[PDB]
Symmetry: C3
Subunit: 134 residues, 3 copies
C-alpha cells in the first residue's frame, strides 16, 4: 500500500525554468508540467511563431513521456494555454498530428501571459500502459 | 494490470470544437473537457449571458457524466474559467445548484479569452461510483 | 470496489469563498482547491505583496494537507496562477522553500484576474502516503 513516485528528468527536453520537475509519476499516473516551445539545448523559444512553438512543446512532451516509458497514446487530458485566442485553429492543426485519435480530454483558453513570453504552453496527464481501449 | 480507457461521446452534449474528446475515462477516473455554454444541437453559445452559459455548460457536463454512468455527485474537482471576474457571484449562484453539497475542490479565475468568445468554461475530474462519503 | 471520498475542512485555513471544498480526497488522491494568500481568521488577503501572499497561500495549503494526514512532500502537481508575470521569480523563490526537492510537476501562467484581486492562486494534486521515491 506504499505508492511509488518517480521524478522524470531527461536532457532530451529542456531543463525546468523554475522549481518544478518535468513530470512526476505516482503509481500509474503521470503529471506532465506545462511544456513551452523551447529548444532543449539552448532553452530559448524556437523561432517561427505559434505553430513552431506548439510543435516544439509537444516534441518536448513526447521526450518526457518516452523517458517514463509512455507515448502520446498514454495522454488522457491536456490543457492548452494560448497567448492569443486567434491562434486556436493553427494550434489545433499541429496538436492533432500528435494526438490523432482517441483524443485526450482538453481545456483551452487564452491567458494574459506565459513564461518567457511564450505563445503556447501545454500540460498533460498520462497513464502508464498497458492501456486497453473500450 | 492493463488499464481500461473509454472515450466518452454523446450527442446529448455538443460536438467538440477541436481535437479533443468530451471526456476520457481511465480505470475509475474521468477527465471531463472544458465545457462551454453551447447548445448541443446548433453548437452556438446560448443567449442571455453568463448565468445562461454557466447553466448550459453544466447541463452539458451532466450529459457527459451520465453517458459514463456518473452524476454530478461523482465530480471531485472543477476549474471555472471566466471572461469577467465580476461574474464570480453570478456564476457561483448557478454552480451551487448543480453541486449543492460535498462540493468539489475548485479553482476559479478570469482568463483573457475563451473559445468562441464564451463567458465561462468549466472542466472537471470525476470518479466513477460507487462512492462512499466519510 | 467502493471508493472512499472525504471532504477536507479545517478552520486552520480560510473558509472557502465560494461553493467549493478546501480539498477532496478520493481513495489516495487529494485535489486541493486554488489557495489564495488569505488570512484564515479574517479572510482578507495578507498585506505586503506577492511574496507574502504566496507564502500565505502555501501555509494555507499546508494546513489542508495536514488535515488529510499529508505534508508538502505529498504534492505531485501544482498550478501557479499569477496576476503579474513579472512576479515569476519572486513567487518561485517563496515556492521552493515549501517544495524544496522532488519538486511537483507544475504549470504557471499569468491570468487576467484572481478572486478578491489576489496576486497569486495555487492549486494542487497530492497523494496520501506512504510514498516511495524511485
Amino acid at each position: 500500500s506504499s505508492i511509488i513516485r518517480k521524478i522524470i528528468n531527461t536532457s532530451k527536453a529542456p531543463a525546468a525554468i523554475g522549481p518544478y520537475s518535468q513530470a512526476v509519476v505516482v503509481d500509474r499516473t503521470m503529471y506532465v508540467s506545462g511544456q513551452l516551445g523551447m529548444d532543449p539545448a539552448s532553452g530559448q523559444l524556437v523561432e517561427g511563431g505559434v505553430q513552431a512553438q506548439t510543435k516544439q512543446a509537444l516534441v518536448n512532451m513526447g521526450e518526457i513521456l518516452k523517458e517514463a516509458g509512455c507515448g502520446y497514446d498514454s495522454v488522457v487530458k491536456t490543457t492548452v494555454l494560448l497567448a492569443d485566442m486567434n491562434d486556436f485553429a493553427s494550434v489545433n492543426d499541429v496538436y492533432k498530428t500528435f494526438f490523432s485519435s482517441s483524443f485526450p480530454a482538453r481545456a483551452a483558453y487564452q491567458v494574459a501571459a506565459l513564461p518567457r513570453g511564450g505563445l503556447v504552453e501545454i500540460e498533460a496527464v498520462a497513464v502508464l500502459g498497458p492501456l486497453t481501449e473500450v
